[PDB]
Amino acid sequence: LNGTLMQYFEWYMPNDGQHWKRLQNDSAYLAEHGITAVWIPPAYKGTSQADVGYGAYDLYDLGEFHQKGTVRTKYGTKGELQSAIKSLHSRDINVYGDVVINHKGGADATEDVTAVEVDPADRNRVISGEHLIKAWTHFHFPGRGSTYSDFKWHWYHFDGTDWDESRKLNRIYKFQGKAWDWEVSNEFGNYDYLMYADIDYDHPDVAAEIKRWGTWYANELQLDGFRLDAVKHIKFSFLRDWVNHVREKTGKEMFTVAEYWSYDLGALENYLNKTNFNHSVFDVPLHYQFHAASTQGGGYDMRKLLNGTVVSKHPLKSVTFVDNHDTQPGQSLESTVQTWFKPLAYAFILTRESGYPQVFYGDMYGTKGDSQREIPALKHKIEPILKARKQYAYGAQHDYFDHHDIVGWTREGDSSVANSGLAALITDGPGGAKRMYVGRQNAGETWHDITGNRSEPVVINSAGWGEFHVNGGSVSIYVQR
Numbered sequence: 197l198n199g200t201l202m203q204y205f206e207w208y209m210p211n212d213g214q215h216w217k218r219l220q221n222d223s224a225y226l227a228e229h230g231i232t233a234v235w236i237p238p239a240y241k242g243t244s245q246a247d248v249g250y251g252a253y254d255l256y257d258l259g260e261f262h263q264k265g266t267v268r269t270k271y272g273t274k275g276e277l278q279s280a281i282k283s284l285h286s287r288d289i290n291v292y293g294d295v296v297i298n299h300k301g302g303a304d305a306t307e308d309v310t311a312v313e314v315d316p317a318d319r320n321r322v323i324s325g326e327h328l329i330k331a332w333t334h335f336h337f338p339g340r341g342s343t344y345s346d347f348k349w350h351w352y353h354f355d356g357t358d359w360d361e362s363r364k365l366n367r368i369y370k371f372q373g374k375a376w377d378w379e380v381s382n383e384f385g386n387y388d389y390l391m392y393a394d395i396d397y398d399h400p401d402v403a404a405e406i407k408r409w410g411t412w413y414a415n416e417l418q419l420d421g422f423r424l425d426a427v428k429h430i431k432f433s434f435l436r437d438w439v440n441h442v443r444e445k446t447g448k449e450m451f452t453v454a455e456y457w458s459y460d461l462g463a464l465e466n467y468l469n470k471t472n473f474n475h476s477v478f479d480v481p482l483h484y485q486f487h488a489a490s491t492q493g494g495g496y497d498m499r500k501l502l503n504g505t506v507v508s509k510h511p512l513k514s515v516t517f518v519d520n521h522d523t524q525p526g527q528s529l530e531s532t533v534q535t536w537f538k539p540l541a542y543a544f545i546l547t548r549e550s551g552y553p554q555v556f557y558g559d560m561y562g563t564k565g566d567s568q569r570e571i572p573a574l575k576h577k578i579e580p581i582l583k584a585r586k587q588y589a590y591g592a593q594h595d596y597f598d599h600h601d602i603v604g605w606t607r608e609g610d611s612s613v614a615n616s617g618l619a620a621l622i623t624d625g626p627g628g629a630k631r632m633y634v635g636r637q638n639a640g641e642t643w644h645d646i647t648g649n650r651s652e653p654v655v656i657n658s659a660g661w662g663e664f665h666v667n668g669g670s671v672s673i674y675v676q677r
């Protein structure tokens with residue numbers, strides 16, 4: 197059975213504390229549509245109750261302690277999360293927890309620290325002398341105390357910050373005696389520093405503590421894997437070691453996917469090599485190709501979809517997706533795949549044999565931001581494609597990318613899955629037909645479009661070929677009737 201991931205959150209969901217209960221209630225629906233794993237948003241205390249979760253104040257507070265003015269996180273309380281995870285596990289759905297370990301935000305107090313300013317354009321270049329600043333670097337977890345962990349954070353557990361409280365100044369500051377970590381992205385010279393207080397992975401105590409927390413987190417929630425946040429800003433060898441550590445300690449496989457944000461496949465292959473392919477990465481280049489096709493009114497050359505993507509070179513180390521919380525409307529990396537094209541993009545990642553596909557909560561249920569271009573709920577257009585993946589997308593694949601608009605592929609089916617096999621056709625322009633091979637063992641079968649876009653079926657000829665049709669700017673997925 198094909199595995200399918202679902203990112204179970206959108207950036208603009210309401211701060212109502214009902215999310216874990218919602219996830220629990222969606223268990224049956226997710227299972228029915230073939231979702232085998234869910235990536236849940238950061239489950240620990242952020243800078244405030246409404247923090248989406250990337251503020252990462254206290255990794256040991258999973259909506260359990262009264263801190264930052266709330267007990268629950270934006271999503272609910274720890275018990276509610278535990279009940280939801282129990283429900284998902286009862287239906288064989290795996291759970292991946294978000295891991296935000298690049299920085300810590302919302303420090304309890306400031307500390308006096310000697311620092312220098314570095315050039316935002318080249319962080320290796322110092323542009324000031326040393327001076328005393330007041331940095332938000334003291335974390336004592338006043339509500340948790342020593343429960344689960346007695347480790348407290350001070351400025352010397354970090355490399356720098358972007359705020360001097362004494363002067364209300366926003367610059368990039370490197371603390372005395374610290375050096376940006378390596379290896380990290382080399383954008384801006386060294387991209388170790390992103391926001392808040394940047395964790396110093398050169399510090400032995402910090403590395404040991406983040407590993408220890410990783411195990412505690414996996415055990416406390418009984419997680420099945422992880423989604424790693426902002427990895428281009430975190431020492432690569434540490435991420436490699438952290439993933440190995442958590443797997444050895446838990447004895448579980450712990451599927452892991454990292455979000456390395458780069459348009460460039462080169463930067464992505466370097467990261468995979470440096471972490472010795474021990475985990476996957478989201479296929480960011482593929483997302484930009486989807487956005488490009490959807491916005492060029494038919495002018496995009498669809499043959500390009502086979503190249504320049506992570507999945508095209510590392511089929512087993514790529515998590516493919518259409519849109520996510522970084523790319524949805526109103527976000528800093530906004531590059532939403534237009535609605536008319538969305539189902540075509542979904543057909544591409546859900547019915548092809550390579551890559552671990554991910555469905556976006558915002559695409560299924562809509563996004564709740566306040567622009568005039570929010571994503572509409574498209575679950576009704578995606579459900580049939582999920583059905584195609586769950587029941588028909590098996591066996592040998594044949595690709596037909598011989599046209600600038602109309603491209604398609606087939607799956608012959610596999611004898612272990614009854615009636616499996618399919619023929620998919622997509623076009624970013626005018627419709628048309630394409631003769632495709634689906635396997636001689638399917639000779640004589642009547643196949644029809646499971647999406648409902650075309651009503652006439654296709655009969656497979658004696659040599660295993662069928663002539664499939666697709667309407668303009670549309671997708672058709674034929675399966676045995």
Ligand SMILES: [Ca+2]
Pocket residue numbers: 298299387388389390394395429430431
């Ligand atoms: Ca960093």
Ligand SMILES: [Ca+2]
Pocket residue numbers: 355374375376377396397398399
């Ligand atoms: Ca450092």
Ligand SMILES: [Ca+2]
Pocket residue numbers: 494495496497498600601624625
């Ligand atoms: Ca085209």
Ligand code: NA
Pocket residue numbers: 354355376377388394395396397
């Ligand atoms: Na650092």
